[model samples]
Target chain A: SMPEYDYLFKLLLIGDSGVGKSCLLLRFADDTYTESYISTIGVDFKIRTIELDGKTIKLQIWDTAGQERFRTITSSRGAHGIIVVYVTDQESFNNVKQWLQEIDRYAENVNKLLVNKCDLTKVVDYTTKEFADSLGIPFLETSATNVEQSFMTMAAEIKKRM
Target chain B: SFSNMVSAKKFYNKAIFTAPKAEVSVKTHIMRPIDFMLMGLREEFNLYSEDHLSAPGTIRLLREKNLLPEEQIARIESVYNQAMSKRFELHAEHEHDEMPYSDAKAMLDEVAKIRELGVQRVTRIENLENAKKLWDNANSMLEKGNISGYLKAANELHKFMKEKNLKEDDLRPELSDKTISPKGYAILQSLWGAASDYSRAAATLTESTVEPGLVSAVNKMSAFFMDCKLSPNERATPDPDFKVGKSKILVGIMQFIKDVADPTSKIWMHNTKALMNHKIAAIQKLERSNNVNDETLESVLSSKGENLSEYLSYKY
Candidate 1:
C-alpha cells in the first residue's frame, strides 16, 4: 500500500548564532564533519529522504538566521516540526527562553531540544533526561565530533512523534 | 489615494528584490490583476487635456499664439470628485458604515478637491536636488522619533528621484572604488562564492538518477549519527563496537529517511523493521556482556590515543 503522506515531514532548525546548528544539520545530511561553516544570513534549507514502514519520506529542513531581529520576522511562518539546537555553555543555555519564545510565536507543535557540543565539557547542568521530561518535549545530547547515543535517541523520538 | 498607490508600487519594487524566488512567484501570481485594475482606474480618473489647458506654444510664442481660456482646474476637480464618489461607495458597501450617502459624498468631494490642488505633489520630488532635500528631511524626522514622517519622506524621495531619473552618483561626493578594502572584499566574495557552489553541489546530488532519494537519505542519516552529541554516560558504555555502531546508525538513518521520503519504499520499510529487531537483540547482548567502568577503560586507552580510530575501525 502507498504511504499516507506524499512528502517527508518538514523540520526547522533554529538556535542562536554559532550554536552548532548548521554543524548538526550538515553532519546529519552529509555524514561528514566540519568545524566551522559561515553564518546563515536569513534562511537556507536542505533536504534528506528516508524510508519508514515501507514508505518513502523526505525531510525538508529549514535553517534560519539566529539574530533577535531576524527571528521576529522569520518566525511568522510555522514549521511542521522543529529542532531547537542549544549549546551546553551556560550563557547559551540561559538564552533558551528567547528561542522558546520565538518557537512559540511560530510553531503550532512542541519542538525537540538538542543540547549540542556535549563532548567538549559537561559544564552546563540543566540538560538531563529528568529536565527534558519536565519540559514535555523530547531532548537529546549530541557531539558532532563523537558519534554517540544521541543518534539513536533523537531518531527514536522523531519516529515516535511522526 | 493616488499617493498611497504610488507608495505601494515603490514598496512592491523594493520587496521583490529581497524576497525569495518562491515568495516572489506567489506574490506576483496573486497581485498582477489588482495592478492592472489600478492602472485602468488611474486612466479613467485623469480628465485634463495637456494641449487644451496649457495654452499651446505660449512659452515660445513668436507672433500671436492662440490662447484657450479653458477652466483646467475645474475640469480636473470634477473628474476627481466623480472618482472619489465611486471609491466612497465601494468603501461604504464593504464597511457597512451608517453614515448618510450625501455626507459620505461631501466628505469624499473635499478629499478630491484637496488632491486636485496637488497637495500630494508637495511630497513628490521631480529632481535630484529635491530628492536629496527630501532624504535629509526624512533623516531629521527619524532622528526626532517621527517614524511615519520618516517613511513618508523616504518614499517620496525615492519617487521624486525616480521620476527625474536620478542616479546614486548624483546625490553626493563620489565614492572611491576602495570604499571597502580590496583584499578584504576579495576574500569575502570568494567565501560567498564557495558557499554558494557547495550548496549547489549538494543540490545536484539530490537530482541524480540512481536512487537519489536513498542516497540523500543515507547522507542525512550519516550526518545525524556523525554529528549526534552524546552524554558522558553514553560514551562510557562499551557494548557496541565502532563498526556495529556505524552499521546500526546507518540502518537507523535509512529507516528515518524511508519513513520520510518514500514510506512505501522497500528498503525503508525493511530496514526500519530490521533495525528495531537488531536494537532489541543488541540491548539484550549488552545486559549479558561484562561492563567495564569508564575509569578503567580510559586508563587502558589513554596511552594509545593516537591509535583509537584505527582500533575502532573494524570490530563489530
Candidate 2:
C-alpha cells in the first residue's frame, strides 16, 4: 500500500536548465546525486514524505523543462502553490527575468530563489544579489553538499508560506 | 482511462484536417434537423466503439467510404441499438422492487444511477485491453534487457494512467489484492521499483552506480515474500501451501542481470545477494518454527552488513 498523506503539496522547481534541479531533488529524496544527470523534460516528478507540524506532509515536487519549445502539463493542481526558481551562476541569474516571463506565460508564478552551487568558491556576484534584493524575492543558498539539513529548512520555510 | 484515450485519438480525425475539399466549398452551411440528427447520433456513435457502431453517422460514413453493403450495415445496426437499449430497459423493469411501489419512481432513480455506473464500467473494460498491451510492451522491453526502452514504455504506461484519471491502486485492484496471483504481483512490483531506481540513478549504463532505493525495494520484496509464507494466526505461523516462486524470481532477476550488465562490474562479486540469501534462510527457519514476530523480522533485516544493500545496480 502507498503511504497515506495527511497533506499533499505540489512544489514547482522552475529555473534555467542545468541549474542542478534534478540533483537538488535527488539529493533530498534519496541523499545521492550523480554527474550523469539528464536534462529534465516537461515536469519531472519525485515524492518525499516529511513530518512538519506533527503531520505527514507528502511533497510532490515538479521540475520544469529548461527549453522553450516544451508545453505539456497533464497533471497539475491549480496554480496555487509556492515556487523556487533555482540558479547556478550569473548566466542562470541572467535568465531569471526570461524565466519569469516563461512562468507568467504558463499562468503560474515563482516565489523564491534557491542559489545552488553555493559550495563553490564562486558565489553569486554582488550585482545578482543586489538585483534579487531589489525585487524582494527571498534567496536561500543551498550547495546540496549538506543534504538533509538544507532540504528540511527549505521544506519548513515552504510550510510556513502555506 | 489511459486505454480509452489511446484508442480515442487513434480513430478520431477532425474533418478539416483529414479531408481536402476537392470540390469548391459552399459559402453558407445551413443546419437542418437531419443534419442535427447526424451530429447528435455521431456523438453517441463516437462513444460506442467503431465495431459496435449502430448510429446513423456510422452508416453514413460507411456508405461514403463504400466500406460495407447498405443492407448489411442497416441490418446489424438496428439489432445492436435495440440490444443496447433493451439492456437498460430489462434491468430497470425486472429489478425494481414492487414491495417499494410506495415510491416506484424513487427506485427508478436509483436504477438510473446504477445504469450510469454500468456505462462507466463498459468504457473502462474496453480501454483496459490497451493498458494491458502497454504493460506487455514494458515487460518485454525489460526481459529483452533494453533498459531505456523499458523506462520509455514504463513512462508511457504512467502517462496513460494519469490521462485516464485513474488512481493506480483503484485501477488495478488485482495487482494489490493479489486475487489473480499475489506472488507474481509482489515480484513484479519489486522489479518495477528496481528498474525505476536504476533509470533515475544511472546517467549511462557504463557510468551509473546504484543508490539506496534499491535496498528499500529489495526490503519490500523480502517482507512481502515473508508475509506470503507466514499466516496471520496468534503466532506468525507459516502457511502450509507456500511456494518457492519468490526464490525463483530472485534467481531469474540475477540471471537476467548477468546477461545484460557489464562483465567487469563488481556488483556480481560484491552486491547484496548474500544478504538476500540470509533473509531467505531466516524465513525458511520461521517456516518450521511455530513463531516469528516484528522483533525477529527486524533482527533478520537489520543485519550488520549481513543485510547490506547491493551498491551496484548492475552485475554481470
Candidate 3:
C-alpha cells in the first residue's frame, strides 16, 4: 500500500553517440555540466520523483550508448516513455529514423525527438518541422548550454502523456 | 569533369551525414542469425594467426562489396561496455560509502572484474565474442540482482572496441538478403532517404560556395545508419505532424526575427542566430510548460533561471 496510488515510468534516452544524450540526462537529473563528456558505454539510468495531480510518479530515465553492436544484448525492459535525440548536424538528424527503428524493436512506447546542439550556426534545413511531422513523432530543439530550455522541454514532454 | 566520382563521393558523404551516432536498437529476425554467424566469423578470425591475411581479407572484401561495415559498430560495442562499467563504479562507490571497509572491499572486488576485462578487447570487431560472453554472464547475474560483473564486462568490452578501427564485417560474417530483418529493412529505408535529404541539402548549400564537398562528406554518413539498420522504430513515416513542436518553435522564432524593426535586433538578425539563441529559447520555454518539477529539472535547463515553464507547457 505504501507504493499505491502512483505510477512508475521508465523513460529511455536514445540516439547516436555525441548527440548530447548523456548530457541531456545529466542536465535533467543532476543539474550539472561537463564539457568533456565521453561516449556512453552502455545503458545508464537516473531516477527522479515528481508529484503529479496529487500522485507521486517516479521517472526512471535510462540512457543508452548510441552505437550498433550493443543492440544484441541491450535490455529494453519496462520502457514506458522514450526520448530520441539527434544533433542539429545533418547526420545526427538523419539518424533519427534509425533511432526510431531501435525503439520500435525494443518496445512500443511513447517517443519524443530532441534535436540538440542548436548553438552551432550551421544552416542546414534538413531538420525542419516538416521532417518530424512526416515521421509522426514529437520534436524539440535544445542546447545543453541553455540548460533551462533543454531540461524544461524534456520534462514537459515526459509529463505530457501522464 | 568527373561528376560520377563527385556523385559517388556525394553519395558516400550523404551516407555518413545521416549515420547514427549511437547503436541502433532493434532485433532482426533475419539479420540476427546472420549476425550470429558473423560473430562466429569474427571469433574464428580472432582465433586465426594475426599474420594470416585470408580471414581478415575475406572480411575486408565484404566491406568493399558494401555488404558489411555496419554503422557505429565499434562505438556501440564500446558504449555498451562503458555504460555497464560506470554503473558498476557507481554501485561500488555507493557501497564504499555505505558499507564497512571489509564489506565494501569484498563488494568492490566482486565488481573489479569489469575494469580488468575493459582493456582486453580493443574494438567491437575484436571483442564481439567476449561481449557476447559478457552479455550471457550479465543476463544470469542480473536475474540475481548482481549486475556488477556483467555490467563491468560489457563496459570493458565496449571500451576496448572504441579505441581501435573496426570494420562492420569484423562484427558480422557475411551480408545477404536473408540477413535483413524487417527492422533492419526499415532502418535501411530511413538511412537511404536521410542520405538523399542530406545530399540535397548539401548540394543546395554548395550552390553558393565551393565548400559543397564538406557538406557532402557529412551527408554520406547516412550510409552508417543504412548499413546497420539498428533502430527499427526510426523507419520513415508519411505522417504530417511528426515533429510539430520543433517546427512551431522554429516558425515562432523566424517570425520574431521578421518582426524585428529596430537596429537593436541586429544581434539576432541572422536566421542561424535567431534560431539558435532567441527562438530556440522561446520554443524551449513553451515546451517546458508540460513539466511537473521543471524548476528542479537540471540537465538541460539554462543556469540563468529563465521562466522556461511558459514555452515548455504548450499543448500543440
Candidate 4:
C-alpha cells in the first residue's frame, strides 16, 4: 500500500486575471502549448514528480483563476511555495501590490515573483526588476512556450524549505 | 608698339603707381606694352604660387599662340623668378608664416600628433567596449542555460583581458574573481552538475539500461537546469571540464516523456494506463506467488519497449 512518491509538496499560484498562471502550469505539467484563452473557473490541480538530493519529491501544484469571483477559492492551506505571476505584455504593469499582499496575508514560504511572456517581451524590463527589488522577493522572467526553467526553479526553491 | 595680347591694357591701370624710373622720359607716365607684359607676368606668378593657380599653363598657351616672342618671354621668366625669390625671403624672415607650402607642412605635422592621441583614446574605449560586450553575451547565454556558449564567451573574455593586461576590476569593479564573480561561478558549477545528472538520467531510460526513478530523475534534471536559468545573476567562467551532452539524448528522453504524458499519444498512453490499472496488480500478484519467470516479467513489461514499473510510476 505504498504511494508513488517520497515527499509531496503543495504549491500555489496567484496573480491578476490573464497573467498566464494556467499557461505556465500546462506547459510544465503537460509540456504542451495552446493559443486559446479559456479562463479557469475556480481552481485546478496538476501533479509532477521531481528528484532532489536522491529523494523523489512529488509536486502537487494548485492553479486558481485570477478573477475576483474565484478569489475566495484560492487557498494557501499547506503550500510549501507560492508563485505570483504577472504579464509583461500589458501597456503598463498595473496594481501588483494589491495581489502580492495576498501572499503576505497567507504564509511566506519560498515565495517567487514571476513575469510571464518574456519571450514576447524579449527581455525583462528595468521597471519589472525594480518592482521585484522593491518587494524584496526573487524574480524570474518566463514564457508559456518554455516554462521548463522557471518551473524547475520553483521546485528547487520548494525543495530547500522542505 | 602694341602687343597682340589685349588683356595687357587691363594690367596697366593696376601697376601704374609702381612705375619704373625709366618712365621719367614719358610725360604722361605711359608705360611700354613690353613693360606692362613683364609686370603682369610677375603678378600672375605670385598669385599662382600663393593660391596654386594655372600661370605656367597660361604662359605656355601664350607661347604656343606666338602672342609673346622669345625675348619678351625671357624677360617675363626673369621677373617671375624675382617674384618667387622675394616671397621666400619674406617667408623665412617671419619664421615661415603666411606662405602656403610652409603653413600646410605645419598643419600636417600637428595632424600626425593628433592621430597618435586619437589612437590612444580608441584603445582605451575599445577595451571597455570589448569587455562589456563579452560580459553581456556571457550573461545572455547563461540566462538561456547554455553552458557551452557561456564558456566560449567567458574564455574569450579572459583571453582579451590577458592581451590587454586588464583585471576584472578594471572593467567591472564589482567583480573580484579571476573570470566571473563568485556568485556567477557558483551557478555555473550547479549547472554543470545538473547537465551531467540529466545525461545520466537520459541514459537510464534507454532500453539497454532501464532503471527505476526514471521519471523522478528526468524531472529533477529539468528542475535543476531551470533553476540556474532563473538565477538573477546567472553567468559562467571558463571550465576545462565542462561538456555539453549530445542533443539527441535530450530529444529521445523528452520523446519518451511526451509519449507517456500526452493523452493524444495513444500508443504509450494506452499501454501505460492498462499497466497501471491491471498489469501492475497482476505482476505484484505473480511475484508474490514466486512461480513466474524473470523472462515473463521482462516480456510483459517490454511489450511496448518500456519497463512496466517505470511506466506505472510515471503514470500516477
Candidate 5:
C-alpha cells in the first residue's frame, strides 16, 4: 500500500539530555502536551505528514538522548542531517566543538542546532546566534508549548533540499 | 506574575518591552489579570473569590477598603466574564482546608515569584507578536495605498526590534511568502545602517551556499538591503509561462555571490562586480509563477547589473 506521500524520510533528532526533544515530538505528532515531562531514556520517534509544493511528505522523526550512553543507538540510522538541541535551563549555550567530535561519529553530512526552550525565564543568553555563526548552523529558538509551525519549518527545509 | 503595584510594574515594563503589539479598543493593560497577579492580588483574589457563600463579596470588599471605586464594581461585573469571576472566587475559597493558604501579606509573595517571566526570551516572543499585529494592520492598509498607516506599523515593529535586540529571523513569522514591502525595507535599512559589512549582508539576501564554511561566513555579515524581501514559500516550479520568479533568482543570486566571492575575502566587491544588471537577470528565474510583488519587481529592475558598492566587503 502507498504511504500517502511522495517521499518518506527518517529525520533524526539529537540533543543534550533534558533539552525538550521529547516535548517537541509529542506536540507536533499528537497535537498534545504532557504536563508531566519525562526524559527520553532510549529511542522515541513519531510519524507526521506535511504539505510542501502541494505534495505530502511523510516524516519519521526519532528523538535520541544526546547522552554518550545512547550514541550507539541514535547513530545506527543514517540521517540526511542531524537536528542538535540544547536548552536555556542548561548553564551554557557554547556548542561548536561538541558537534565536530560527533560529526565524524555520525556521518559525513551537515547538521543544524536546535536550541530548546526560549519561553522560560532567563533561559538563553543573547549570544546564542553569535554561536550559530561559530557553529555553522541555522540556530532555531523554539517553544514546543507554543505552536507546530516553528518545527514544521524543518520539514519545509527538507522539502526544498529534496 | 507580579509582586505588587511596584513589582507588577517592573515585570510589566520587561514584558511590555517586547509584549505582543495589539490594538485593543480598551486598555486591558490597566491592572490586567497578570498585572493583578503581580499586584499581590492573585492571592487575594484567589482567596476572596473562592467562597461559595461569599462569592459576591470581592467587589464589595475592595470597595469598602477603598481599593476599588464604587462604579468599578458594576464595571467588574460587566467586563469580567463568568469564567474569570468563577476562577478567582474558587481560588479564594478554602476547599483544601488542610493546607494553610498564604496570608494577604504573604500572598504578595506570589507577585515576587512571578517576576521570573521577565526574561529576554519572552521579550522576543511578545515583541514578535506585536510586530505581527501591526504587520497585519499594515497589510490591510496596503490594499488602499494607505502608506501612512503602513509606515506606522513598520516603524513601530522596527523600533521594537532594535529595543529588544531582535534579529531579522526573530521578527519574521513562519510563512512561505514573507512579504517585505518597500516601506518595510526602508525601515529595516534605517535600523541597520550601511556601517554593516557589505559582503556578509549580501549573503543574507539569498541564504544557503555550496561551500558550508562560506555560507556560514556570509551569514555573519552585519548590513542588509532596504529594497528587497525573501519569498521562501513562493518556490518556483517548472512553470511554462512566467518568465521568472523572485525565489528562483534569489537562490541564483545567493549562489552567484558565493560563487564569485572567495572563502576568506573581506569585501563583496572582490568578485560580485558582475552581478545582474537586469530584472530577469537578477533572480535569474521565477520559483513560483507570477508570485512576485510589485515592490520587489521594481526593486530588481532598478538594480539590474548592480555592483557590490552597497555591501562592499566580504566576511571571514
Candidate 6:
C-alpha cells in the first residue's frame, strides 16, 4: 500500500531571475514558502502525489534557479509539464518568450506561462495574453496567493494530456 | 546508502531544533531503531498499538526528569504495560522475526528495567542525576512562564556540568565511549544498514522542508546513528575522549545553525564561525595525536554544509 503510484509525471519550473520560481515550487511541494531569498543552487526536486482518474500520480517537480546558466542544463526532457514563471515587472515579463523557446528546444510537453505577483500593479498584462494566444499555449495570472490552485490546475492539465 | 541516512538524520535533528519545545512532540520526532524494529511486527505479529511502543518509556523518562507533564506520565504507564504484555505474548508464541526479535526485546527490557529501578540507580552517575534535577527545576520555571529563569537554569546546568567535569555522554550510555559487547555492536551495525534504505527513500520525498511524520520517521534512525558513533569499538579508537569532544562540537554546530537568531546577524555569523573553527581545531588535534589517519581526516574535514571554508575564514 506504500508508495503506490500508477503514473509518475516530471514537471519543470523555469523563469527569469527572481520571478519566484523557487517560491512556487516550495509552496507546491511543502505547502510553505519563505520570504528570504536563498538561491536554489544546482537543481532540487520535491515529490507530491495526487489522485487523478482513480490513479495515484506522483509529481516530481524540479525547481531550477532563475539564472540563464541553469535554464537548459537542468533536466527538462520527458517532463510532463513546463511552468515558465514571470513576475508582473516588465523585464521578467519580456523574458517569458525566451523561456518558452528554451522549453521547445529542450522538451516536448504541456507548457504554461504563469504570470506571478498578480497582487502587484499590473504593468505587462495585454502582452502576456497576446503572447500566449500567439504561441497556442495557456497563460494565467497568479500571485503568491492561491499557489495550490495554480499547481493543481497544472497537474490536471498534465493528466488530461496523458 | 549509509551516507544518505546520515544526511536524513541531520534533517531530523534540524526539525527538532526548529520547532519550539511546546510545538514539538516527543512522540512526533523522537523515535529510534526500536520503533523501526517493532513497526514490521505491528502488522505481521498483530501488535496492539503503533503510537505507544517506545513512546510510553520515553514519556516516563521525561516525567522523571519533569521535562513533560505528570498527568501524561500517569496515562502512559498502563498503555506501556499493556503493549509490553502483548510483546511478551509474542515472545511466548515465537512469532517475531529471528533477527529483530532479540534486539527489540533487549530495548524493551531496558525500558522496563529503567522504570522499575528509577533513573538514579540505573546510571549511578551523580552529576547526571543532578543534571536531571536541574532540568526538572528548569521545566518548572518554564511552566510558570518565567523565560529568563528558564534561560538562567540552562546556564546553571552548564556551569554545574563544567564544574563537575561531566561530559554530555556521561548521562547517555548510548553516546558514552564505553566498549559495548560485540553482540550489541553488531546489532547497531545491522540497524544502521537497515535504516539506510529508508533514508534514501525518504530523501526523495523532500529537499529543504520538514513534512509531518517524516521528521519522526527519519529521527527513529538517528538514535541508532548516535548510539553507534561514540562507542569505542566502532571506530577502534584508543582515546575515546577525542570522539567525545568531536561529536559534542559537531552537535553544537548543528544546534547553533538551526536555532540561531538570524544568518545575516553579525553575532550569529561570528558565533557560527567560532563553532566551525572549534570543529576544525578538534579534527586537527586528532590528526596531531595520530589518532586518526589521513583518509579519515580528509573525510572528517569535509562536511555536508555548503560554505565550510568560507565560514572558517570569514572576514566579519
* Best candidate according to DockQ: 5
Lowest lDDT block of 10, candidate 5 chain B:
B220-229
Better model by lDDT, 4 or 6? 4
User: Per-residue CA lDDT of candidate 6, range B1-316, in tens?
Assistant: 1122223333322332122221112222222322432232222222343332555445444555664356544533543454455556555764331223333444344444323322322233445557656645644553453433543454455557657766544444322323333433333232222222222222222222221112222223233223223432123112222222333323332332233223442211244344445545656657577676434533333332335574455344
Docking class of 1: incorrect
Better of 1 and 6 by lDDT: 6
Tens-digit per-residue lDDT, B1-316, candidate 4: 1121123324433333232331021211222322444445434222223331344555565566664466555544554454445446655674332333432343333333333333443354457556767666766666565654554455456557667866544454222222443444444444433333332222212221111123333333333222322332232343435433323223233333343333332223353334333444545555567645434543433344355575566457
Give the TM-scores of the predictions, in the order they appear: 0.30, 0.29, 0.31, 0.29, 0.29, 0.31
Tell me the deviation in Å of residue B314 in model 4: 35
lDDT tens readout by residue for model 5, A1-162: 133567555555655544556666765453121111111011134556777788777665544311222222223324544666665564334442465345545564444544556435545665646756664666666664443666577666666675
Q: Which stretches of candidate 2 lie over 4 Å from their true place?
A: A1-3, A30-43, A65-68, A71-90, A101-111, A118-123, A144-150, A157-162, B1-316
- Give the CAPRI class of candidate 2: incorrect
**Clash pairs for candidate 2:** none
| Model 4 chain A: worst 10 consecutive residues (lDDT sum) | A34-43
* Per-residue C-alpha lDDT of model 3 across residues B217-273, encoded as one tens digit per residue: 222222332333233233333223231232332233233223322222221112322
Q: Which ten residues in a row have the lowest lDDT in candidate 3 chain A?
A: A33-42
Give DockQ per model, in order: 0.02, 0.02, 0.02, 0.01, 0.03, 0.01
**Cα DockQ of the candidate 3 complex:** 0.02
Best by lDDT: 4
lDDT tens string, model 1, A69-145?
12323322334566666745666665665666555555544446545673354456554355456546666665544
TM-score of chain A, predicted model 2, versus the true chain A, to 2 decimals = 0.62
Model 5 share of native interface contacts: 0.00
Superposed by TM-score, candidate 2 places the C-alpha of residue B308 at a distance from the truth, in angstroms, of 43
TM-scores of chain A in all candidate models: 0.64, 0.62, 0.64, 0.70, 0.68, 0.72
Clashes of 6: 1
Instruction: Flag regions of model 5 displaced more than 4 Å.
Output: A30-43, A65-68, A71-77, A91-97, A104-111, A118-123, A144-147, B1-316
